[PDB]
């Protein structure tokens, strides 16, 4: 059982040899699902480097199931080292594109260097990879749109949420007097008013944060007050939208619109890194379960709706082309993030601040094209006949 | 290998015993890939020797089959569900037939990417593809000329005659389908063009029923005012490739719309698309992966007319409707389908078709954005 | 000259006869241009060649035009009898919208003021109501008068239909355009001063007849302003205002402007000023430049009636502007201004009775902008004896 | 009256040339159809052998009314020589502006520019190339609509076509107005229904002849064959109209297009077309024949729609700045109407990026900058402008 695993890894295993093989699977020693095992190893090093069969069983037994899949290469991407080397090549290629313009409309976005570039990957199995500046905090901005949508649907269900907001691209209101979808400001503002009704903003914010925290496997989620204050002061177009929505009676009964706008600016100001965000995207890749905690964050219904709208509406005006050429659900944001989901496989956050004319981060856009150019991840690729493409699940 | 299979099924196997067990896997005794085997049986209780002699040539396929390795391992179960969904849509009596056909005609056909087949309803009655051909001829065009060339002439996304670039919005609208028609087999006459497409559709269908309705073609082309208006407009905006005869393309276009299929043959067509360009019952490579992926993308967003976005959100499967009441349905990596009932809703889609498609995804985890690990209460037919 | 007029009107004239003959021409004895004559007559009960010349001397040229039938509409009594029929005819049309309770009957009134100062009224013409959108052409004329055509039209469009190709509101007659126009006027001072200034201007337009302000309407508009705040934030976002504009304050000024009150009678003089080329008919004072008055009439023509503007231009062919209080400011260039007021509105937002009356006026008279003055077929021409 | 007139012109006897020179200075042409008997007697009188009171009476008696108004300065523009002198200056000023493109290009001669005036009293003036024939093209649009309304009335015509400024169709699934191609095709299908194109065409041609006081109206077959070849977009419209059921019952659409191209290919000069516009300014009566041609409601409707819809995409700006009903065409013509005063035709082929003749447009602005002709100018108070009626 745990003995079997011992043999696949002589009389006694040096600990470092166990750790090194574990880290090659793509797992991180700090994985919450590995905690018992790692605690035991560290404790063992104290009271003791070689592990005999009996010691190994002792350290590895609590986590044995997860550990067996790792070593039996049952993970979604079994040769991860090979895959990450491709990710790096693609990272390097995109890094040669200097074009684009960093958003200057508020001091917090403008300060960011155009030359910051990073990519983080988290598979639905919890395998992690990062290259570039992946520990630098930035604001989600519109990348928050699908997440608060997912929350709303999780709590209120499809039918209700979509009384208030549309299901498709625009190509302020559709024929039915609703904003076109959750990924446009008008739609996001309305989705924001749907969450945790009848409570003050402080608890609403906290409530939302609980969700993000879980989606991120308790990795970094933070808040930029500097950005919130600036968004709120320069927010004229969003105020125009708010008054219009109120005038057309688009909000739930009793809504305080100005309060909702404040909440909305707050939500846009939430901070992540590529690493933590990649976990959020992996939760969406994993059907609502956080890949690194095994926790159930969101209903399958919420995740399906959200991925559908990211595919359709997620890239601003580039959505149609992105869907045709990339065919992956994604959400761009003005700070230069692109939240990417390859369903059943992994999730990513790509970050470079310079934007193209559509509003999309130039290196992210270029990286996403290459990713699908290389691998058979396009939504409508086939898993049997893919031509020259590479399939990393094999 | 033929030995193992033999034991799996006493000293001798009655022929019928092997036949009914084979049928139970979803395959038909007439599968083109089973020909050698069925010929060997026609040349004769099989003892081990006669059995090995008969099945040796088809062994690999038969092995996949009897070892429950097909994309849907328990097909008899999956079939029973298709039947319930069918009987449920059958009770929906609404819609309006376009204008000769009888309402109450309803049929559904399935072909898995492994060539497993099922049918219920009026499944052998030939009807016209109409706009169902749109993705088919777009696939042919991308197959021969590639993505970059074809999309010089036509858009890649939905609308809401020409887009901001002076191209028709996509291949699934009439304007776009007319332009696409002008791209195929350029410079050759219409007669050869029609033969070429007809040959291409034969491959897609694994050589099952494909036909032409001259009656439909005649009336279509007399009533084609809106399409004529479109042709003159496209010509004037210089939308066609140099040297196009637009009045001739419209002819060809009306012809392509009049091509006939049954639910059964058209389901194989959809199966080719679900199989990455390989025909499931012939094993023949038909379209390039590039052509198939483009086609599925545009059917997903553009395929259902004004109901496209609603259909993508709820059903999440590439599909293409036509005014005869066909819906060409693709579940990638799993199966193709054709649903046929003539009565249409206000949007132009078959009423029973639409109902069936919703229920199918309500039941099974086939939605494009369903997860294959956590699906809640949905059935997964692949298990 | 005074003698000429004297004989025209025995040894002595009874003075009730001069008054009666005067009123007969359409002028009122309260006409600001007749004051001296009326004061001299107050000092004086029969008028001999001598007393008559004394009373009438000051104003003689105006009274001569009046008695010699030189006025734009020489036979006025006949023309007002027609206005009355049209009035009764439109009166009988009771459709429109303002479990509604009703404590009192419907209000309907029509006032006519000619470019010569001839006046007529029937119905409820003394009851104050808010201009609302009727104020739009008025404040646009002010802006153009003060700033000129080039400057105003950097901020707003000249054509019918939030923003057009150039990211300007379409014209001065739509809310977005009227909000921008509001921001153009008196940019130096504070809001109280801007309001006084506009109010003074409307006094000139009206020959100092009734104009006022309704605080109730103003507060009600303030509370209901979501639609107008949406527009106000959008305009700001798109940088549609002149530099240093306080947009929230401009809307407040906007609501005040919509809340200004008039009567059918005083508003008809406002319209007669626009019909008279910028000169107030009853004071002879020059209120607005010709450029401001031409620009205003042109935009009233195409843009003045909401979504009925096109149909109205084609069938009626007169510059007009309507508002939700039920008013229709009507202009007939070179002839007269009018104000029609009934509160019930049709589905397009225009006063039911007002619209009916405007149609009938042009069916009857050759006032349609594209009518011909030589060959009019069946129509009546009131400019002729 | 004949004696009164004789005295104002007179001395014991009037030299013939002196009566003629005075007549011309009023703006009337000697060839005026309404002056025919007068001129006939005059020529007859020179044969049988200086006018005395009795001889002068004999000559002008049949035409006395019109001649009396002319000499008494009762014409809409009493000082006509002063006015034409202004027209000439505006013409020269429009000339120095050579921008625009005619519908690497070679040039075999100078570009043509001409301006004709016909007053509602039949006073004439021309300067520039005013006798050169050119195709009406879209300038024919208000003319054929006026015919439709004349024969069919407002209700019938506007059951098929919109009344407002402006896809091919409005919310009623009717073309937006008579001045856009789709609307003008539908109007074309209204006229003289149930006869062959040859008969319909002769019918419009005689109508055009009356509007023009029987001055030049013609046809360009070269232009027609060309329109017929390049009409892909008009055939697109034709099939769309047909698809949407915009034509009256039983119309042959392909035949209707053919009639339409014909109507576009009709030819005028600046002079003949100025009389056409003057008919529209005169309430349906032709100024030089005194003949009733179009009904008042047809003339009103046409002027209304020219005002708002006449200049293509410049209609909005044109109405605002110029305030005159006008219609322009791809040949470089602008048919202009000052209601109650005059008609005009301006012709220069080079077009601006909107499709309007550059010289015509420039001339129209200057005309209104100078004169109080703007639809919304006041007649009593106008500022620096001059009023030619005074
Ligand atoms: Cl954003
Ligand atoms: Cl179809
Ligand atoms: Cl209003
Ligand atoms: Cl033209």
Curated annotation (Swiss-Prot), chain B:
UniProt modification remark: Synthesized as a 74-kDa cytosolic precursor which is proteolytically processed by the mitochondrial-processing peptidase (MPP) via a 72-kDa intermediate to yield the mature mitochondrial 68- and 65-kDa subunits.
Record entry for activity regulation: Isoform 1 and isoform 2 are activated by phosphate, due to increased affinity for glutamine. At phosphate concentrations above 10 mM, isoform 2 is more efficient than isoform 1.
A Gene Ontology term for the protein's cellular component: cytosol
Keywords: Acetylation, ANK repeat, Cytoplasm, Hydrolase, Mitochondrion, Phosphoprotein, Repeat, Transit peptide
Domain notes: A highly mobile activation loop at the dimer-dimer interface is important for enzyme activity. The C-terminal ANK repeats prevent the assembly of the supra-tetrameric filaments.
Oligomeric and partner information: Homotetramer, dimer of dimers. The tetramers can assemble into rod-like oligomers (in vitro), but the physiological significance of this is not clear. Interacts with RAF1 and MAP2K2. Interacts with ATCAY; the interaction is direct and may control GLS localization, negatively regulating its activity.
Protein family per UniProt: Belongs to the glutaminase family.
Protein name listed in UniProt: Glutaminase kidney isoform, mitochondrial
Lineage: Eukaryota, Metazoa, Chordata, Craniata, Vertebrata
Entire-sequence positions represented here: 144 to 549 of 674
């Amino acid at each position: 059982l745990e003995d079997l695993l011992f043999y696949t890894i002589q009389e006694k295993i040096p600990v470092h040899k166990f750790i090194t093989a574990l880290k090659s699977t793509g797992l991180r020693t700090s994985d919450p699902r590995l905690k018992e095992c790692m605690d035991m190893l560290r404790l063992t090093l104290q009271t003791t480097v070689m592990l005999d069969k009996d010691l190994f069983k002792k350290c590895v037994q609590s986590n044995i199931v997860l550990l067996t899949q790792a070593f039996r290469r049952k993970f979604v991407i079994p040769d991860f080292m090979s895959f990450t080397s491709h990710i790096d090549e693609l990272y390097e290629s995109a890094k040669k594109q200097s074009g684009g313009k960093v958003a200057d409309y508020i001091p917090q976005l403008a300060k960011f260097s155009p030359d910051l570039w990073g990519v983080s990957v988290c598979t639905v199995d919890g395998q992690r990879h990062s290259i570039g500046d992946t520990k630098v905090p930035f604001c989600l901005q519109s990348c928050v749109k699908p997440l608060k949508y997912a929350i709303a649907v999780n709590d209120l269900g499809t039918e209700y949420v979509h009384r208030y907001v549309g299901k498709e691209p625009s190509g302020f209101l559709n024929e039915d007097d609703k904003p076109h979808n959750p990924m446009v400001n008008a739609g996001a503002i309305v989705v924001t008013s749907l969450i945790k009704q009848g409570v003050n903003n402080a608890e609403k914010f906290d409530y939302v944060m609980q969700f993000l925290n879980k989606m991120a496997g308790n990795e970094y989620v933070g808040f930029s007050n500097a950005t919130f204050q600036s968004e709120r002061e320069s927010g004229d177009r969003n105020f125009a939208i708010g008054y219009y929505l109120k005038e057309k009676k688009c909000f739930p009964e009793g809504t305080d619109m100005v309060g909702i706008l404040d909440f909305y600016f707050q939500l846009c100001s939430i901070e992540v890194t590529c690493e933590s965000a990649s976990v959020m995207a992996a939760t969406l890749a994993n059907g609502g379960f956080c890949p690194i905690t095994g926790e159930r964050v969101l209903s399958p219904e919420a995740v399906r709706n959200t991925l559908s709208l990211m595919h359709s509406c997620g890239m601003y005006d580039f959505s149609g082309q992105f869907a045709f050429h990339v065919g992956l659900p994604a959400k761009s944001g003005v700070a230069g993030g692109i939240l990417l989901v390859v369903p059943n496989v992994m999730g990513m956050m790509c970050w470079s601040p310079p934007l193209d004319k559509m509003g999309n981060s130039v290196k992210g856009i270029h990286f996403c094209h290459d990713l699908v150019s290389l691998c058979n991840f396009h939504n409508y690729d086939n898993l049997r006949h893919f031509a020259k493409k590479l399939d990393p699940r094999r």
